[model samples]
Target: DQVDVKDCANNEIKKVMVDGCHGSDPCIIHRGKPFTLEALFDANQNTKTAKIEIKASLDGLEIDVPGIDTNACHFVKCPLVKGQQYDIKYTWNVPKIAPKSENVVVTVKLIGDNGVLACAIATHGKIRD
Candidate 1:
């Protein structure tokens, strides 16, 4: 449930707003630029994780970015006392060769050796002109 954008020199910079971002869309996938897409995600009560994909609707190619999980964590769980929290992290590399100015869908799906999938949610993103 955390996101950030950074520079190639490993500095956090203020850039344009990612389309369909939280605080507005909540569950909407968003578009961003300048460098990379570093997302830190969490899931319910598993105490485990997988190599699930962070799908996007943008036409830009994926690029190798940076990591932004420098704190504790999100998605706390025990379900009874604390709830369950599974962590899913990804670094989406945005390419310079984007064909369109927007991306409509950004998805996270369960795939091989990654998902036990007790529960899941899908969110779409956007890019504006």
Candidate 2:
């Protein structure tokens, strides 16, 4: 799934497409400002259910948004719009195990679910002038 943020500060959003899976390096850039988090999932085969969790951290404090749906791949607007630096993390789970990349932003942890398949993470930001 590819994720991107555009037209952030000026209220005009542009779409940026990303590719690959776990360990595939983060494509979104955080330039020290407030921005939206976008997510997409490529549910190939064994993916029965998929969910996204986002956690933002700064100065050792953490804020979490849970269970963003995998369907539609919508743009999730952040609460703070212009000036904040946050570290974002995304987690996804599936039913059939799949190949993951080592450079994926979100670490794929195998849980006790026998049906779990694939997961990934991406991070981006909006810099306010």
Candidate 3:
């Protein structure tokens, strides 16, 4: 799958889909372009302080996506409530700084006051010109 549950996640998240992505295949992401990502997950804990973290791996080197927002409340409902399901979606741009690679991995983490609430990973991302 283009997106899957991260190893550390609690399995509260599922059905992660990204634009131009599909099952068991590398997603072609053109640099200087935008794509939408959607996910379905349930909140495991309540927290007023919510945030999102995104990182990209080029080969084995990890890099940050500076163009995306880290505020989870901005993209989803604020003050996350426990046991509530959320269908979150966001559009992101692949910055020009992203280098061409055949084995790029992207990770997204949702954090609350406690710690990581949920996680998703996109593997075999092909970033191109």
TM-score between candidate 2 and the true structure: 0.28
Q: Per-candidate TM vs. native? A: 0.37, 0.28, 0.89
Cα miss at 16, model 3 (Å)? 0.5
Candidate 2's residue-wise lDDT over 6-116, tens digit each? 221222222223333222334422232223433322222232233334333333344343344433213232332223222223332221222222222322211112332
Off by over 4 Å in 2: 1-35, 66-129
For model 1, what is the alpha-carbon lDDT of residue 21? 48
What lDDT does the true structure give each of the candidates? 0.33, 0.29, 0.78
Give the range of the ten consecutive residues with the poorest summed lDDT in model 1: 7-16
Error of 3 at 57 (Å): 0.5
The residue-by-residue lDDT of candidate 3 on 10-126, one tens digit each, is 887767888878875778778888867787889999999778777778876887767567787888887889999888787777788777899888777888998888887777677
Angstrom error of the Cα, residue 44, model 2: value is 6.3
Judge candidate 2 at residue 67 and give its lDDT. Answer: 40
Please name the candidate that would achieve the greatest lDDT relative to the true structure: 3
Error of 2 at 38 (Å): 3.0
RMSD, one per candidate, in order: 11.2, 15.9, 1.9
lDDT of 1 at 109: 38
